[PDB]
Design a protein around this ligand. Structure first.
Ligand SMILES: *[C@@H]1O[C@H](CO)[C@@H](O[C@@H]2O[C@H](CO)[C@@H](O)[C@H](O)[C@H]2NC(C)=O)[C@H](O)[C@H]1NC(C)=O
Ligand SMILES: *[C@@H]1O[C@H](CO)[C@@H](O[C@@H]2O[C@H](CO)[C@@H](O)[C@H](O)[C@H]2NC(C)=O)[C@H](O)[C@H]1NC(C)=O
Ligand SMILES: *[C@@H]1O[C@H](CO)[C@@H](O[C@@H]2O[C@H](CO)[C@@H](O)[C@H](O)[C@H]2NC(C)=O)[C@H](O)[C@H]1NC(C)=O
Ligand SMILES: *[C@@H]1O[C@H](CO)[C@@H](O)[C@H](O)[C@H]1NC(C)=O
Ligand SMILES: *[C@@H]1O[C@H](CO)[C@@H](O)[C@H](O)[C@H]1NC(C)=O
Ligand SMILES: *[C@@H]1O[C@H](CO)[C@@H](O)[C@H](O)[C@H]1NC(C)=O
Lengths: 48, 125, 189, 145
């Protein structure tokens, strides 16, 4: 998803479903490559 | 609050110039001040903000590594040290006041502020 | 310097009268047969509670200071007894290095053994007894003052002959009340 | 208190703590402004990435939803302890009767019994006494020692 070559237009935003896997959020919330990593009603750390 | 800017003027590319801005009134310790600029025919653009307590600084990408913002608490004055001036720095510079305290420092880049200074012109030849 | 705190530092933990009964109670007491630091001025911690004692001939020791920093910028407690009255204040005092604004509370009221207990608001128990270093035996401390001040305290010092400091701990005690409601013996559980 | 605590443009004088390393204990008051370390890098009092200011302002505008409108709150805690009780209701006192079965109330301590002159040697501080059963056995009249 993040290293995908091409993205969709906002009007036709793509939806990828994630299921039956282990979600390693550390790689994301500890990385410095994202300018906005905003989460509402949940904390990234708690996600684990 | 009343905001009064100074320090604008004519400078050669490569030089350095310090703008000043005096804050009076409800000088909240948990608020922030930001500097923004407007070039002719362009919209006003946020440059940098600093929190009064602690002095942590936030910079726009357009100015990161060149400009420094500082404040002297005792004097209730905030300073923007504008180093390595470039033609693209040409604009009217305004210092603005926030009365809203935000946990996320980056929000001061986009937050709509309460009060604005009058602006001081910097022109780079 | 150290001495043995044989059986001293027992105070009535509550305001209830009890006669000819053994009552078990949990509170901050001085553990029996513990080490009490012996001084004959310095600044001392205030871990959870303090047992102070003084053997006096000329009443040199007069008062106590309590608090966190023991200079201004914080609410600190000061207690001073001068011959005829007692003074208590919780002002943000500027204390001296060797002592001897915003006052939010104020109250005004060897052979001599004077025993005090300071604990946390603020409770002061005390007892005066004649004696023949730290005496072996048993005597209970009646409450004297209850200050509802709520001052955060973690350190203290004395304002002036030797004194002793012990530290209270949360220990369960069995107390023997006689016919007259006086505590006459105790057991450290 | 929307009429008072809200203003056009947003009133931000009222703050709340938004991050904390642990939940508060009952009636704990924390006023510290240390930069919250959300990530692994120590902040050293400097805000930035994973280094946030622990406080945030409230947005109290008159046009805000009732859920977001300002409300003034008072919390009364009552100290039902074993000490002399100094905060009482307006309830008037009455005369005392001895040697009769009566429904008595001393400072909120209620019961039914026969009140007699006692010979117990209460100490100047001792407020009321108890029996082996931890039941009230003797009292001090609030008006008379
Ligand atoms: C009461 O005051 C003391 C002393 O001012 C406080 O103790 C501090 O605690 C923190 C965290 O453990 C330490 O980093 C400091 O070094 C302590 N102070 C000193 C002078 O050593 C304590 O937090 C205060 N408690 C309350 C409830 O206010
Ligand atoms: C002990 O010290 C206190 C305070 O320094 C003295 O109490 C004062 O007494 C005078 C006498 O009228 C009063 O006007 C003051 O209001 C009192 N102030 C306080 C804080 O108590 C007392 O005189 C001293 N006793 C001595 C020296 O024997
Ligand atoms: C409890 O108190 C009573 C009196 O308040 C004590 O009895 C008195 O003891 C003194 C001590 O010498 C005598 O002078 C009196 O003659 C006693 N009075 C009576 C009426 O006996 C009593 O001893 C105390 N309890 C204990 C265990 O000693
Ligand atoms: C008290 O101190 C002495 C000397 O340091 C020591 O020998 C003794 O064991 C101590 N007693 C205690 C810790 O109960
Ligand atoms: C005493 O109270 C005033 C009023 O808020 C305050 O300005 C001052 O800081 C206080 N004194 C100290 C030592 O903090
Ligand atoms: C009020 O109570 C005190 C208690 O010490 C007593 O001295 C006084 O006589 C009482 N007065 C009235 C009017 O009840």
């Amino acid at each position: 998803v993040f290293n995908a070559t091409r993205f969709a237009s906002v009007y036709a935003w793509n939806r990828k479903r994630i299921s039956n896997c282990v979600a390693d959020y550390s790689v994301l919330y500890n990385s410095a490559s994202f300018s906005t990593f905003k989460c509402y009603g949940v904390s990234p750390t708690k996600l684990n | 609050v009343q905001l009064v800017e100074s320090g604008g003027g004519l400078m050669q590319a490569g030089g350095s110039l310090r703008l000043s801005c005096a804050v009076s009134g409800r000088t909240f310790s948990t608020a922030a001040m930001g500097w923004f600029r407007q070039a002719p025919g362009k919209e006003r653009e946020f440059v940098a903000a600093i929190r009064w307590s602690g002095g942590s600084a936030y910079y726009a990408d357009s100015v990161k590594g060149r400009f420094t913002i500082s404040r002297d608490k005792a004097k209730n004055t905030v300073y923007l040290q504008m180093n390595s001036l470039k033609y693209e720095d040409t604009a009217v510079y305004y210092c603005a006041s926030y009365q809203a305290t935000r946990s996320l420092l980056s929000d001061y880049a986009t937050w709509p502020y309460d009060y604005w200074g009058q602006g001081t012109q910097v022109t780079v030849s | 310097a150290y001495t043995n705190s044989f059986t001293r530092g027992v105070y009535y933990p509550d305001k209830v009268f009890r006669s000819s009964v053994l009552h078990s109670t949990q509170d901050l007491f001085l553990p029996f047969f513990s080490n009490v630091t012996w001084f004959h001025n310095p600044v001392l911690p205030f871990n959870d509670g303090v047992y102070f004692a003084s053997t006096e001939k000329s009443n040199i020791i007069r008062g106590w200071i309590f608090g966190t920093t023991l200079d201004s910028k914080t609410q600190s407690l000061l207690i001073v007894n001068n011959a005829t009255n007692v003074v208590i204040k919780v002002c943000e005092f500027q204390f001296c290095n060797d002592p001897f604004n915003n006052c939010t509370f104020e109250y005004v009221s060897f052979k001599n053994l004077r025993e005090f207990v300071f604990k946390n608001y603020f409770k002061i128990y005390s007892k005066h007894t004649p004696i023949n270093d730290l005496p072996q035996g048993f005597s209970a401390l009646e409450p004297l003052v209850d200050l509802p001040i709520g001052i955060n305290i973690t350190r203290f010092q004395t304002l002036l002959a030797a004194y002793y400091v012990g530290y209270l701990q949360p220990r369960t005690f069995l107390l023997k009340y006689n016919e007259n409601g006086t505590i006459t013996d105790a057991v450290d559980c | 208190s929307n009429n008072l605590d809200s203003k056009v443009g947003g009133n931000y004088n009222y703050l709340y703590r938004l991050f904390r390393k642990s939940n508060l204990k009952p009636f704990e008051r924390d006023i510290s402004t240390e930069i919250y370390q959300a990530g692994s890098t120590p902040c050293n009092g400097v805000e930035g990435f994973n280094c946030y200011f622990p406080l945030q302002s409230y947005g109290f505008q008159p046009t805000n939803g009732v859920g977001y409108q300002p409300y003034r709150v008072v919390v009364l805690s009552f100290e039902l302890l074993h000490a002399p009780a100094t905060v009482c209701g307006p309830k008037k006192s009455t005369n005392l009767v001895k040697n009769k079965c009566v429904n008595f109330n001393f400072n909120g301590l209620t019961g039914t019994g026969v009140l007699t002159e006692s010979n117990k040697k209460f100490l100047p501080f001792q407020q009321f006494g108890r029996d082996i059963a931890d039941t009230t056995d003797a009292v001090r009249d609030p008006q008379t020692l």
